[PDB]
TrEMBL record, chains A, B:
PROSITE patterns on file: OMPR_PHOB (PS51755), RESPONSE_REGULATORY (PS50110)
Gene3D superfamilies named in the record: 3.40.50.2300, Winged helix-like DNA-binding domain superfamily/Winged helix DNA-binding domain
Keyword terms of this UniProt record: DNA-binding, Phosphoprotein, Transcription, Transcription regulation, Two-component regulatory system
Domain Response regulatory: 3-117
Protein name per its UniProtKB record: Response regulator
InterPro entries: CheY-like_superfamily, OmpR/PhoB-type_DNA-bd, Sig_transdc_resp-reg_C-effctor, Sig_transdc_resp-reg_receiver, WalR-like, WH-like_DNA-bd_sf
Length: 229, 229
């Protein structure tokens, strides 16, 4: 459950925004004083802090600079009317992840907050996009359908097998059993590298053709890679 | 929101398992018939299908074989008692992404499903295999706290600045503004390439030092990348 700190000076809006955010299963701490919002953000890591340009007892810009002393990458979004935001736009753009104008439909606001959260979560997986190979010899990879064809024949690779093939095709360098573990079984706390050899064998038995070189190369030393034909 | 097809013969466990999965914001379709489970799996793409070894009107092995005609990389996990799973283990190991024994703690099962999901997403987003970069020149990245140090000095990068620096550091290649948009503003629908240039300048003003090369390299007419010292 993502945690949100909410200081909104229009109490009617605050109430209904809080309700809709909770409907999305976010946790909402509603607050009303700048200095108490700051003390709360210092002691609690919020996934999002939603503020107006002027908090009452301080400006959002001062809130953000103070907080930044210890939590410099804090996720702050500003919600305000046109004139208030326009007057401070340049500074808001510096400290705020995003800003949105009142008057505001709550659903558009909740939608923007969800986008920010997804975008932050994507950065947090350290996913460096790389170009995907879609052929190898007479194998065709249909990435959108997670299907594989040998010539025109669909090969019914399971998910794990599909994943193993893609990991091998994705690396020019040979991969160790350990690197394969950390790839195809990433996040699962897998220990035995012996399961790698089970699934190589499953993979070969689906792909390889008799009289032909195997599509998978065993580098007896180190690990596995794809087998040039 | 990840979608799960759940056919568990023990209705008490099924009920609580469904609730705990929903708390992670997963959508759970509870079923009780193997034939209905199959018809649902053909007509909608589930991220995970959770089954016992025997579905009642058919074996999970038959379910998987029929499904694999259309959807060969379907994500199927088997939950069952020792004797049921042991008796079918070799077969299950071929068609199932994973298996887990009853009696089972719900919290353990949710954690394993979540891991499997993240593992599929790493493959499906074509993330590089390389380790997240944590240094560049005299920069140190504390990934857990989203903080950055230049020497011993903490630089107060904003979340957006941080995400941008991470995306640049994440890629050996030059990134175009369109690529930077699609990663640092992923899901935010941004279409103005101009904002990338604005945050590059913000990043430089925080990191760069007089009489040093900039940490960021402008590649005229292409995009941006990191700047060797």
């Amino acid at each position: 459950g993502k945690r949100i700190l909410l200081l909104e000076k229009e109490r009617n809006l605050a109430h209904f925004l809080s309700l809709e955010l909770q409907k999305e299963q976010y946790r909402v701490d509603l607050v009303e004083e700048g200095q108490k919002a700051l003390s709360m953000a210092l002691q609690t890591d919020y996934d999002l802090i939603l503020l107006n340009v002027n908090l009452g007892d301080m400006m959002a810009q001062d809130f953000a600079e103070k907080l930044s002393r210890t939590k410099p990458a804090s996720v702050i979004m500003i919600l305000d009317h046109w004139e208030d935001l326009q007057e401070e736009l340049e500074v808001v753009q510096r400290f705020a992840v995003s800003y949105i104008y009142k008057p505001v439909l709550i659903e558009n606001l909740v939608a923007r907050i969800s986008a920010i959260f997804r975008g932050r979560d994507f950065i947090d997986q350290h996913c460096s996009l790389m170009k995907v190979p879609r052929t190898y010899r007479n194998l065709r990879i249909d990435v959108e359908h997670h299907t594989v064809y040998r010539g025109e024949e669909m090969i019914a690779l399971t998910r794990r097998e599909y994943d193993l093939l893609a990991t091998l095709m994705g690396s020019k360098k040979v991969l160790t059993r350990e690197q394969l573990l950390e790839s195809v079984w990433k996040y699962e706390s897998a220990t035995e590298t012996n399961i790698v050899d089970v699934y190589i064998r499953y993979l070969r038995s689906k792909l390889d053709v008799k009289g032909q070189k195997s599509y998978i190369k065993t580098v007896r030393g180190v690990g596995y890679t794809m087998q040039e034909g």
